[PDB]
């Protein structure tokens with residue numbers, strides 16, 4: 382109902398996963414960042430909705446599923462019902478978005494966050510209108526089996542800054558990374 386946003390951590394080789402996991406060792410503050418960003422609602426009494434593919438839901442450890450304080454929606458054409466812990470199941474990105482507009486969640490959803498995987502990212506990226514990409518650039522190459530789609534710089538503008546997102550290069554476990562925000566409106 383508010384903003385449509387994507388959030389991803391990508392290596393310099395554009396990788397996002399490896400055998401059901403993140404291609405690098407776990408970054409606990411990257412994660413804290415991901416939690417803070419998708420969890421905070423710019424409006425009282427409203428909650429954010431997170432959309433993810435089926436493989437993304439199964440890659441999150443059980444202890445962490447469902448993502449707390451958010452409406453969790455899984456995308457699948459094969460599941461008959463939401464996985465255990467999940468709140469909604471949709472068969473496509475359009476229906477996930479049309480549901481937002483159901484008087485049910487009428488006034489319950491604030492921002493919508495696309496949290497993975499590839500398939501779900503590309504399709505949000507081609508979705509017309511206004512969208513923001515929140516990209517954590519992991520500054521090294523990592524052997525990966527899943528990639529993030531190409532960012533069209535003719536459509537996406539990298540922002541010079543954004544409220545609540547550090548602009549300095551971070552370092553954890555001896556790997557460097559930085560946070561970026563891209564905006565579109567076609």
Ligand SMILES: NC(=O)C1=CN([C@@H]2O[C@H](COP(=O)(O)OP(=O)(O)OC[C@H]3O[C@@H](n4cnc5c(N)ncnc54)[C@H](OP(=O)(O)O)[C@@H]3O)[C@@H](O)[C@H]2O)C=CC1
Nearest residue numbers: 390398402434435436437440457458459473497498499500
């Ligand atoms: N570094 C990072 O930020 C992130 C990394 N990841 C990682 O990426 C991998 C998961 O990636 P990926 O393989 O791309 O998986 P996805 O999570 O996108 O799972 C794909 C499944 O989801 C369903 N689905 C996906 N897109 C759609 C759609 N548009 N409409 C309907 N159903 C859809 C389909 O399910 P069905 O087959 O059941 O139809 C499809 O098989 C793991 O490695 C995970 O750890 C994930 C998120 C962020």
Ligand SMILES: COc1ccc(OC)c(Cc2cnc3nc(N)nc(N)c3c2C)c1
Nearest residue numbers: 388389390412415440441442445496497517
């Ligand atoms: C251990 O907690 C996990 C493990 C795996 C896992 O998804 C692959 C997640 C979810 C997770 C974590 N950090 C992220 N970090 C960023 N920047 N973007 C994401 N989309 C993201 C996601 C979806 C959380």
